């Protein structure tokens with residue numbers, strides 16, 4: 170009926186009544202759980218539900234304006250096979266999509282999202298202008314502001330606007346001869362696509378990639394981000410003097426650009442969004458994942474730890490100092506950053522706010538709990554319920 | 570139809586075909602996932618399936634022996650509502666239950682399990698003797714050996730044998746008149762139950778609780794484990810000289826005693842089992858959980874860390890050193906223990922073995938990934954499929970509730 174969830178640190182229980190409202194199917198069945206896996210009339214039912222959500226949000230549900238809107242969309246769909254959202258609806262929908270993202274621990278900030286309407290975009294060049302503007306606004310010289318820029322919706326019998334890059338700012342990954350990768354291993358494919366489309370590659374570990382922007386029915390076009398718009402942070406450790414010499418750095422702006430935004434049945438294949446970094450994403454995942462920069466052993470060796478035996482907990486010790494270096498460096502550079510303890514505590518507050526506001530909150534435990542020191546944070550001890558609500562952000566296949 | 574699971578570190582992909590054989594329903598539905606939540610004709614089909622499993626295991630499927638077995642089990646259930654397992658079947662069944670435990674990261678060891686048959690136990694006193702013998706064998710002076718002791722099965726006509734304690738060795742949790750708890754806060758209820766039943770309590774932080782054992786339809790009885798049978802390890806740190814002054818310690822043997830063992834439709838409400846500790850369970854959960862010993866702040870302060878701000882990562886640093894103290898202490902005392910890196914690496918080998926052997930393996934990601942340094946272990950990057958197979962270890966309601 171209603172999932173009963175317990176917080177094991179306090180013993181409190183709540184019921185996630187919002188889950189009974191889940192609009193789409195997940196991959197689990199009563200026979201087996203797949204929670205750990207990373208990956209016309211229908212349009213109308215989704216559109217109506219969304220319009221209903223919008224009017225409820227402004228406390229005008231059941232009004233003649235609400236009825237008029239419903240009829241307006243039904244008419245548009247009959248006449249064109251699709252419909253258009255009003256600016257206020259787009260803004261509400263984009264905020265709801267963030268609010269609804271089960272894997273995001275930074276949702277306490279959902280209501281403060283700044284939504285840029287780029288549905289008037291006509292070309293790859295105009296896209297670029299929007300992207301540079303988003304980066305300038307969002308970065309704000311270190312005092313980051315959450316934002317999303319929404320490009321034109323998917324339309325039948327017309328290609329999509331697409332940003333080939335996974336994030337607005339990413340480091341190149343160069344296949345070396347010996348099979349190794351110089352730079353970020355996660356970006357080998359996009360790096361090679363950029364080279365193929367005319368980019369002259371660098372040869373460093375932290376070379377900022379160019380953007381491959383695609384306008385409807387046009388091949389992707391290459392654009393170089395002005396270095397003055399890309400704020401970066403050189404990494405140093407507060408006590409380990411040699412850390413700075415490793416030459417490690419990371420960018421200030423985490424801007425996912427390959428996800429699809431769905432609002433009332435409409436799809437926006439290009440709608441880059443950005444907030445600010447939770448330190449573990451950089452320190453633990455980006456820098457320490459075995460398939461990423463994999464710097465753990467290199468750092469442990471510099472700290473002079475016994476890397477001969479697992480029981481010395483050399484990996485754990487190195488990891489903690491790498492995260493300390495990240496936090497210390499961003500704070501020194503005056504660039505917004507949140508540590509995993511502060512972030513998880515704010516998420517517990519978000520859960521409480523949502524229990525009061527909607528009677529629940531879709532949350533994916535495996536993604537909410539940080540990659541290091543999980544049980545040292547409050548979210549680890551909190552049972553969660555994962556489900557799909559729309560508006561939403563969804564994964565989509567790469568354009569190539 | 571078959572779940573595709575990927576390892577993100579290697580890139581490799583496998584399909585869990587074993588999952589299609591899931592024997593019972595979990596809590597998830599297509600609408601919502603609840604994986605993070607901690608908690609006659611029927612008998613016949615489960616019994617026949619178990620017998621089929623046993624015969625396949627000894628490569629005699631379809632033999633006359635297999636056929637007679639099925640008929641005998643059917644005859645017994647038809648006449649009595651239950652049946653008698655053979656000794657070899659009980660042994661096979663106990664190992665499969667461990668093998669099938671989704672939340673256990675130590676399953677690489679599933680085939681090496683000593684099974685003590687106690688199905689003819691007739692009293693709480695005899696149950697105590699069986700338990701003392703189990704603890705003795707399992708502890709083996711520090712060279713721990715996996716074991717399980719199986720008490721009489723549940724059956725029509727009488728109540729069940731039950732062990733009230735959650736583990737054979739646990740520390741008392743005393744409510745202080747001030748609302749705080751001395752000892753282990755997780756054990757306040759069982760501690761109070763022991764006192765209610767006749768136990769005059771101690772007043773320490775690490776007082777081994779007496780066993781509260783119950784024979785069918787009788788009030789539980791109290792028994793105190795001879796101290797010489799309970800091996801403990803005093804905690805010290807290899808470089809932090811003051812750590813030893815905290816007076817911390819932990820027991821050598823992790824022996825879960827409140828789960829029900831299910832084999833071929835038969836249920837064994839009392840069947841305590843034990844292996845050896847994965848260091849984080851002691852260092853991170855038992856000592857650092859806010860609702861447990863909660864020693865993080867005391868340690869960070871003695872380490873002279875800045876506990877006024879979360880961004881100094883004082884919590885993380887202290888936890889790492891507490892785990893270091895646990896590993897160092899057990900290694901020094903010559904008591905078996907395994908760190909989370911070694912344990913997760915072995916479980917990755919287990920997954921590989923099971924893929925070849927059964928075409929899959931039920932695994933609960935949230936429990937397999939250690940409480941600290943999750944992404945630093947290989948299991949974090951391995952997608953998993955969670956499902957129920959029988960024989961199995963299941964949770965059951967407390968005997969007083």
Ligand code: HEM
Nearest residue numbers: 267270272273274275278315316442443444445446447562
């Ligand atoms: C304000 C600061 C923010 C923080 C600290 C934050 C943090 C996070 C973290 C830690 C994850 C999990 C990534 C991982 O470790 O695997 C995540 C995922 C996600 N976040 Fe947030 N986030 C923020 C803002 C935003 C904004 C502005 C949006 C959109 C408007 C958003 C949308 C999402 C989505 C859709 C995911 C899932 C991505 C995926 O599954 O690949 N986040 N976020």
Ligand code: HEM
Nearest residue numbers: 667670672673674675678715842843844845846847936962
């Ligand atoms: C050989 C050493 C062993 C190690 C290192 C090991 C380790 C673990 C760990 C770390 C957990 C998770 C505990 C938690 O999340 O709090 C677990 C759970 C479990 N283990 Fe093992 N284990 C071992 C042996 C055994 C044996 C001998 C059995 C049974 C015959 C067993 C049965 C189980 C079961 C049923 C669970 C689930 C417990 C629950 O859900 O509360 N384990 N084990």
Ligand SMILES: O=[N+]([O-])c1cccc2cn[nH]c12
Nearest residue numbers: 423425443444445446447450
């Ligand atoms: O870890 N993060 O901070 C993070 C991860 C994924 C998306 C976004 C957007 N802002 N911050 C994010």
Ligand SMILES: O=[N+]([O-])c1cccc2cn[nH]c12
Nearest residue numbers: 823825843844845846847850
């Ligand atoms: O953490 N552990 O080592 C652990 C947890 C739960 C049950 C058993 C049995 N042996 N070791 C166990």
Ligand SMILES: [Zn+2]
Nearest residue numbers: 197202597602
């Ligand atoms: Zn699930």
